[PDB]
Every structure is written in C-alpha cells, then in structure tokens.
CSV table of C-alpha atoms in Angstrom, one decimal:
chain,number,residue,atom,x,y,z
A,1,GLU,CA,0.1,-0.1,0.1
A,2,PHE,CA,2.1,2.8,-1.3
A,3,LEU,CA,2.1,5.9,-3.9
A,4,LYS,CA,4.8,6.1,-6.5
A,5,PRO,CA,6.6,9.4,-8.2
A,6,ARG,CA,5.8,10.0,-11.8
A,7,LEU,CA,8.1,12.2,-13.6
A,8,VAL,CA,6.0,14.9,-15.3
A,9,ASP,CA,6.6,18.6,-17.3
A,10,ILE,CA,10.3,19.4,-17.1
A,11,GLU,CA,9.8,23.3,-18.1
A,12,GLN,CA,13.1,24.9,-20.0
A,13,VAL,CA,13.0,28.6,-19.0
A,14,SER,CA,16.6,28.8,-20.7
A,15,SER,CA,19.1,26.4,-22.5
A,16,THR,CA,20.8,25.8,-19.5
A,17,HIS,CA,18.7,26.1,-16.7
A,18,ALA,CA,15.5,23.6,-16.0
A,19,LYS,CA,12.6,23.3,-13.8
A,20,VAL,CA,11.4,19.4,-13.6
A,21,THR,CA,8.7,18.3,-11.4
A,22,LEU,CA,7.3,15.0,-9.8
A,23,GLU,CA,3.8,14.9,-8.8
A,24,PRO,CA,2.8,11.8,-7.0
A,25,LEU,CA,4.5,12.4,-4.0
A,26,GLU,CA,3.8,10.5,-0.3
A,27,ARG,CA,3.9,12.9,2.6
A,28,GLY,CA,7.2,13.0,4.2
A,29,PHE,CA,9.1,11.5,0.5
A,30,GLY,CA,9.6,15.2,-1.1
A,31,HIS,CA,12.1,16.5,1.2
A,32,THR,CA,13.9,12.5,1.4
A,33,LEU,CA,13.6,12.9,-2.4
A,34,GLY,CA,14.8,16.2,-3.0
A,35,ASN,CA,17.7,15.8,-0.8
A,36,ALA,CA,18.8,12.9,-2.2
A,37,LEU,CA,18.9,14.0,-6.1
A,38,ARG,CA,20.2,17.4,-5.0
A,39,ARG,CA,23.3,15.5,-2.8
A,40,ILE,CA,23.4,13.0,-6.4
A,41,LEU,CA,23.3,15.7,-8.5
A,42,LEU,CA,25.9,18.0,-7.5
A,43,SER,CA,28.4,15.4,-6.5
A,44,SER,CA,28.5,12.7,-9.2
A,45,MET,CA,27.2,13.6,-12.4
A,46,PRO,CA,29.4,12.5,-15.2
A,47,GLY,CA,30.1,15.4,-17.5
A,48,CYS,CA,33.0,15.9,-20.0
A,49,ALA,CA,35.6,18.4,-19.9
A,50,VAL,CA,39.0,20.3,-21.6
A,51,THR,CA,42.1,17.8,-19.7
A,52,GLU,CA,44.8,19.6,-21.3
A,53,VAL,CA,46.0,21.8,-24.4
A,54,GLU,CA,48.8,22.2,-26.8
A,55,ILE,CA,49.7,25.6,-28.0
A,56,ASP,CA,52.5,25.6,-30.8
A,57,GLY,CA,54.8,28.7,-29.3
A,58,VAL,CA,54.2,28.0,-25.7
A,59,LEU,CA,56.4,26.2,-23.7
A,60,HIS,CA,54.6,26.6,-20.4
A,61,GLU,CA,51.6,28.2,-18.9
A,62,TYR,CA,53.4,31.1,-18.1
A,63,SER,CA,54.9,32.1,-21.5
A,64,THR,CA,52.5,35.0,-23.8
A,65,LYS,CA,51.9,34.6,-27.3
A,66,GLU,CA,52.8,37.6,-29.7
A,67,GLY,CA,49.5,39.1,-30.5
A,68,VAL,CA,46.8,38.1,-27.8
A,69,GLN,CA,46.2,40.2,-24.5
A,70,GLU,CA,45.5,36.8,-22.1
A,71,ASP,CA,48.1,35.4,-20.6
A,72,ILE,CA,48.6,31.4,-21.9
A,73,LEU,CA,47.5,30.8,-18.2
A,74,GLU,CA,44.1,33.1,-18.6
A,75,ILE,CA,43.6,31.3,-21.8
A,76,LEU,CA,43.8,27.9,-19.8
A,77,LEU,CA,41.2,29.4,-17.2
A,78,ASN,CA,39.2,30.8,-20.0
A,79,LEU,CA,39.2,26.7,-21.4
A,80,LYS,CA,38.1,25.3,-17.9
A,81,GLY,CA,35.0,27.2,-18.6
A,82,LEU,CA,34.2,25.5,-21.8
A,83,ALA,CA,30.8,23.5,-21.7
A,84,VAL,CA,30.9,20.9,-24.3
A,85,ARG,CA,29.1,17.5,-25.0
A,86,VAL,CA,31.0,14.7,-26.1
A,87,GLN,CA,28.4,11.5,-27.3
A,88,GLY,CA,30.6,8.9,-27.9
A,89,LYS,CA,34.0,8.6,-27.5
A,90,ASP,CA,35.9,9.4,-24.2
A,91,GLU,CA,38.6,11.4,-25.4
A,92,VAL,CA,38.4,13.7,-28.1
A,93,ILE,CA,41.2,16.0,-29.6
A,94,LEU,CA,39.1,19.5,-30.9
A,95,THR,CA,41.4,21.7,-32.6
A,96,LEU,CA,41.1,25.6,-32.9
A,97,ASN,CA,43.2,27.6,-35.6
A,98,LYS,CA,41.9,31.4,-36.1
A,99,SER,CA,44.0,34.5,-37.5
A,100,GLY,CA,43.6,38.0,-37.9
A,101,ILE,CA,42.4,40.6,-35.6
A,102,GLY,CA,39.1,39.9,-33.0
A,103,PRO,CA,38.1,37.6,-29.9
A,104,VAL,CA,38.8,33.9,-30.6
A,105,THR,CA,35.6,32.2,-28.9
A,106,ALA,CA,34.4,28.8,-28.7
A,107,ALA,CA,32.7,28.9,-32.0
A,108,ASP,CA,35.9,29.2,-34.0
A,109,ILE,CA,36.5,25.1,-32.9
A,110,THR,CA,36.6,22.6,-35.5
A,111,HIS,CA,33.7,21.6,-35.8
A,112,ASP,CA,33.7,17.9,-35.2
A,113,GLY,CA,30.2,15.3,-35.3
A,114,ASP,CA,30.7,13.7,-32.5
A,115,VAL,CA,31.0,17.3,-30.3
A,116,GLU,CA,28.3,19.8,-29.8
A,117,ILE,CA,29.6,23.3,-28.4
A,118,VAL,CA,27.2,24.2,-26.1
A,119,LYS,CA,27.7,27.9,-25.9
A,120,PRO,CA,29.7,29.1,-29.0
A,121,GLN,CA,29.5,32.8,-27.8
A,122,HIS,CA,32.2,31.8,-24.9
A,123,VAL,CA,35.0,33.6,-25.4
A,124,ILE,CA,38.8,32.2,-25.4
A,125,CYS,CA,41.3,34.5,-26.3
A,126,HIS,CA,42.1,37.6,-28.1
A,127,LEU,CA,44.0,38.8,-31.2
A,128,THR,CA,45.4,42.1,-31.4
A,129,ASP,CA,47.4,41.8,-34.5
A,130,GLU,CA,46.6,41.5,-38.0
A,131,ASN,CA,49.5,39.0,-39.1
A,132,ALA,CA,48.8,36.6,-35.2
A,133,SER,CA,47.7,33.3,-35.5
A,134,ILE,CA,46.4,30.8,-32.5
A,135,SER,CA,46.8,27.2,-33.2
A,136,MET,CA,45.6,24.9,-30.3
A,137,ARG,CA,44.9,21.3,-29.9
A,138,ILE,CA,42.7,20.9,-27.1
A,139,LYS,CA,42.0,17.3,-25.3
A,140,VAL,CA,38.6,16.9,-23.7
A,141,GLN,CA,38.1,13.7,-21.7
A,142,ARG,CA,34.8,12.2,-19.9
A,143,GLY,CA,34.9,11.9,-16.1
A,144,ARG,CA,33.0,12.4,-13.3
A,145,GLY,CA,33.7,15.1,-10.3
A,146,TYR,CA,36.3,17.0,-9.7
A,147,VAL,CA,40.3,15.8,-10.7
A,148,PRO,CA,42.7,18.4,-10.4
A,149,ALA,CA,46.5,18.2,-12.3
A,150,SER,CA,48.5,17.8,-8.9
A,151,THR,CA,46.8,14.5,-8.2
A,152,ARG,CA,46.8,13.0,-12.3
A,153,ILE,CA,50.5,14.1,-11.9
A,154,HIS,CA,51.0,10.0,-10.4
A,155,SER,CA,49.6,9.0,-13.4
A,156,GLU,CA,51.8,11.4,-15.6
A,157,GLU,CA,51.9,8.2,-18.4
A,158,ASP,CA,54.6,10.5,-20.4
A,159,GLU,CA,54.0,14.1,-19.9
A,160,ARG,CA,57.3,14.0,-21.9
A,161,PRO,CA,56.2,17.2,-24.3
A,162,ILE,CA,57.0,20.2,-22.4
A,163,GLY,CA,54.0,21.7,-24.7
A,164,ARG,CA,51.5,19.9,-22.7
A,165,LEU,CA,49.6,22.3,-20.8
A,166,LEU,CA,47.4,20.5,-17.6
A,167,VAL,CA,44.4,22.4,-17.0
A,168,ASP,CA,42.4,21.2,-14.1
A,169,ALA,CA,39.1,19.3,-14.6
A,170,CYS,CA,35.5,20.3,-13.6
A,171,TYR,CA,34.0,16.6,-14.8
A,172,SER,CA,30.8,18.0,-13.6
A,173,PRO,CA,27.5,19.6,-15.4
A,174,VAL,CA,25.6,20.6,-12.5
A,175,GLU,CA,26.0,24.1,-10.9
A,176,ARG,CA,23.0,24.6,-8.8
A,177,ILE,CA,20.1,22.4,-7.6
A,178,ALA,CA,17.1,23.5,-5.6
A,179,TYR,CA,13.9,22.0,-4.4
A,180,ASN,CA,11.0,22.7,-3.3
A,181,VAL,CA,8.1,20.3,-2.0
A,182,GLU,CA,4.7,21.7,-2.4
A,183,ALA,CA,0.9,20.6,-2.4
A,184,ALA,CA,0.1,18.5,-4.9
A,185,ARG,CA,-3.8,18.9,-5.1
A,186,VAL,CA,-4.9,15.2,-6.7
A,187,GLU,CA,-8.2,15.4,-7.4
A,188,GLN,CA,-9.1,12.8,-5.2
A,189,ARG,CA,-6.6,12.7,-2.2
A,190,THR,CA,-6.5,15.6,0.5
A,191,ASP,CA,-2.3,16.2,1.5
A,192,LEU,CA,0.1,15.0,-1.4
A,193,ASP,CA,3.3,16.8,-2.6
A,194,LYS,CA,4.6,17.5,-5.4
A,195,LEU,CA,8.7,18.3,-5.9
A,196,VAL,CA,10.0,20.9,-8.0
A,197,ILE,CA,13.6,20.8,-8.4
A,198,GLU,CA,14.9,23.7,-10.3
A,199,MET,CA,18.8,23.2,-11.8
A,200,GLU,CA,21.0,25.1,-13.8
A,201,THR,CA,23.7,23.2,-15.5
A,202,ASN,CA,26.1,24.3,-18.0
A,203,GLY,CA,24.1,23.2,-20.9
A,204,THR,CA,25.8,19.4,-21.8
A,205,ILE,CA,23.2,17.1,-19.5
A,206,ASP,CA,19.7,17.0,-20.2
A,207,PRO,CA,17.2,17.1,-17.4
A,208,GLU,CA,15.8,14.0,-18.1
A,209,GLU,CA,19.0,11.9,-18.0
A,210,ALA,CA,20.3,14.1,-15.3
A,211,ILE,CA,17.3,13.1,-12.9
A,212,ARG,CA,17.4,9.5,-14.3
A,213,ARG,CA,20.8,8.7,-13.9
A,214,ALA,CA,21.1,10.3,-10.3
A,215,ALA,CA,18.1,8.3,-9.4
A,216,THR,CA,20.0,5.1,-11.0
A,217,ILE,CA,22.4,5.7,-8.8
A,218,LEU,CA,20.9,6.2,-5.5
A,219,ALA,CA,18.4,2.6,-6.4
A,220,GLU,CA,22.0,1.0,-7.0
A,221,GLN,CA,23.3,1.8,-3.2
A,222,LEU,CA,19.9,0.8,-2.2
A,223,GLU,CA,20.1,-2.6,-3.9
A,224,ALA,CA,23.8,-3.1,-2.0
A,225,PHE,CA,21.4,-2.1,0.8
A,226,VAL,CA,18.4,-5.2,-0.1
A,227,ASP,CA,20.7,-8.1,0.8
A,228,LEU,CA,22.8,-7.9,4.3
A,229,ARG,CA,25.3,-11.1,4.7
A,230,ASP,CA,25.1,-10.9,8.5
A,231,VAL,CA,27.8,-14.2,7.6
B,1,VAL,CA,83.4,33.4,-9.9
B,2,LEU,CA,83.4,32.4,-13.8
B,3,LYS,CA,79.7,31.7,-14.1
B,4,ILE,CA,76.6,31.5,-12.8
B,5,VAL,CA,73.4,29.8,-14.1
B,6,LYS,CA,70.1,31.0,-12.4
B,7,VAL,CA,66.9,29.0,-12.8
B,8,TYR,CA,63.2,30.0,-11.9
B,9,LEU,CA,61.0,27.7,-10.9
B,10,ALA,CA,57.0,28.5,-10.6
B,11,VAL,CA,54.9,26.9,-8.4
B,12,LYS,CA,50.6,26.8,-8.4
B,13,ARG,CA,49.8,26.8,-5.1
B,14,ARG,CA,46.6,25.4,-4.2
B,15,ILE,CA,44.1,26.4,-0.9
B,16,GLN,CA,44.3,23.2,1.4
B,17,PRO,CA,43.3,22.5,5.1
B,18,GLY,CA,46.2,24.3,7.1
B,19,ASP,CA,46.6,27.3,5.3
B,20,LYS,CA,46.0,30.7,6.7
B,21,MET,CA,43.2,33.0,5.6
B,22,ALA,CA,42.0,36.4,7.0
B,23,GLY,CA,39.8,39.4,6.9
B,24,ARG,CA,40.3,42.8,6.8
B,25,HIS,CA,39.4,42.9,10.3
B,26,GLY,CA,41.3,40.8,12.3
B,27,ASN,CA,39.3,37.8,12.0
B,28,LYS,CA,41.9,34.9,11.3
B,29,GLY,CA,42.0,31.1,10.9
B,30,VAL,CA,43.3,28.1,9.5
B,31,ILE,CA,41.4,26.0,6.7
B,32,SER,CA,40.3,23.3,8.3
B,33,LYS,CA,38.2,21.3,6.2
B,34,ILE,CA,37.2,21.5,2.0
B,35,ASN,CA,33.5,20.4,2.0
B,36,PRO,CA,32.2,19.1,-1.3
B,37,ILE,CA,29.7,21.4,-2.6
B,38,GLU,CA,26.4,19.2,-1.4
B,39,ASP,CA,27.5,19.4,2.2
B,40,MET,CA,27.6,22.9,2.6
B,41,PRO,CA,24.6,25.1,3.4
B,42,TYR,CA,22.1,26.5,0.9
B,43,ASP,CA,19.6,29.2,0.8
B,44,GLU,CA,15.9,28.7,-0.7
B,45,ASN,CA,17.3,29.4,-3.8
B,46,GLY,CA,19.7,26.3,-3.6
B,47,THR,CA,23.1,29.0,-3.7
B,48,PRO,CA,25.6,27.2,-1.6
B,49,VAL,CA,27.7,29.2,0.8
C-alpha cells in the first residue's frame, strides 16, 4: 500500500536552466527525494571537460603569445569554463585555428560530428594583430567529479612533451540545484506533495537524463542495501 | 667565480587544509576542511555558501 512518483512536465526556462516536477509524492518523501537527488546531482553527475591543451609557440603556462592580450594561463582558465558535450568517445581532440584581429570564441573550434559546443559565444582569447595567429589542440575527456592536475601527476603516463598544458578538470555539468516540496492537490486526495527541482547546468546534460541517472545511482546503492550478509 | 646559472621555478599552490586565511577586520583562521558542494549550507534558491 503505497504511492509512487511519476516524472511530469520538465519546463525549460533557458538552455542551461531547467525545472523538473514530480507529482505524486507521498507525505514525507518530498524532502527525502529532494535532498537525495540534490546530493547525487551536485556530486556525481558525469560530464566532459578539457584536460590538457597544446598551443604551438608556448612552452609553459606562463609564457605569452604575440598578438594576444590574455596570458596563456588565463587562456587555460577560460578553457576550464568551456561547456562541451561529447557523445560517443571518451577522449576527443578538438582543434582551434584562428587568425587576424578579433575575439577567438569557442565557435571557431573545428566542427567535429560527435562533439557539441554548447555556448559558441564563449570567449577563449583575443587576438590583436593582423598577422597574429593562434592554433591549439584541446584534449577533452569524460569523467565524474573534480580531478586536479596535481593528483593525475601520479599517473603522468609520459607527459614528456613540454608543449603539454595540464588543465584542472571539473567533470561536472550541474552548477546549482534547489528543490521545493509543495502541496500537490490531486483530484481524489487530501494531502499529497509535489517535488519541484530547479537546476542550473552548463548545458550539456539534459534534465531528464540527469534526474534518471541520479535516481539510478541512488537505486544501485539501495540494491547494495537490500541484501545483508550478517555471515 | 667563472659563471653563474640561475633557474626560476614557478609553482601553482592551491588552498588546502592548514593554510591561513584572514579578513580585513582582524579575523584569522586555519583552513580546517574542504567540504563538497553538496554538504555546504544552501539558501532556498539553492546557492551554497
């Protein structure tokens, strides 16, 4: 004798911001599910992000190119924010080649099939010289959580090329999560609740898939709970 | 002395537990723990501190 929640309308206010509703929630489970999902989403949502970059004329993060105004280090800091969606492969190599005066945005990346650049207006660099040209090859991986360079250094795995520029990996698409449990007047019932999850992401994971995967992870851990050895 | 060779190392030091942080008003402290985003308090809107 229970009720159970069914995923209902998923409002999209912006490309990044989304509201997801769950209508038939039993009394008391509003907050339980809200918080469990909030935790899972903020912690464990898999995403793809840039791990390392190779630019031609630059030995290390601290040098500088002719005809650009950002330092190379600031270029990496801008790349960390690059929101990208990878579909099939786990590690993709994007290529950015731009010349002439203008802001090098993410749109200028060489368009590959499997990779989606979510925010093409996202700036990367600014050239300032007619003959100034920037080329770089950005390696993008899939992962969960947050992995810094210094930890992966244990697993260097032939980092020998001095042209390599390691970037801190924020393998996480979800930026913000809030939930409200509010009275869900069901036509034949007195006291039922609806959970409304408002989530702000970098626009790679879709809301439906995020919620489904989070529920999946929580359910798997619950599976771990169902059996108890006691042996 | 015939000759000298100087080498500059640059190191990016990230904040970690034990570093000292302060305000402008005389408040001090040692960074005691790095919490995951989910554990941190959050307002109704969902923004964590």
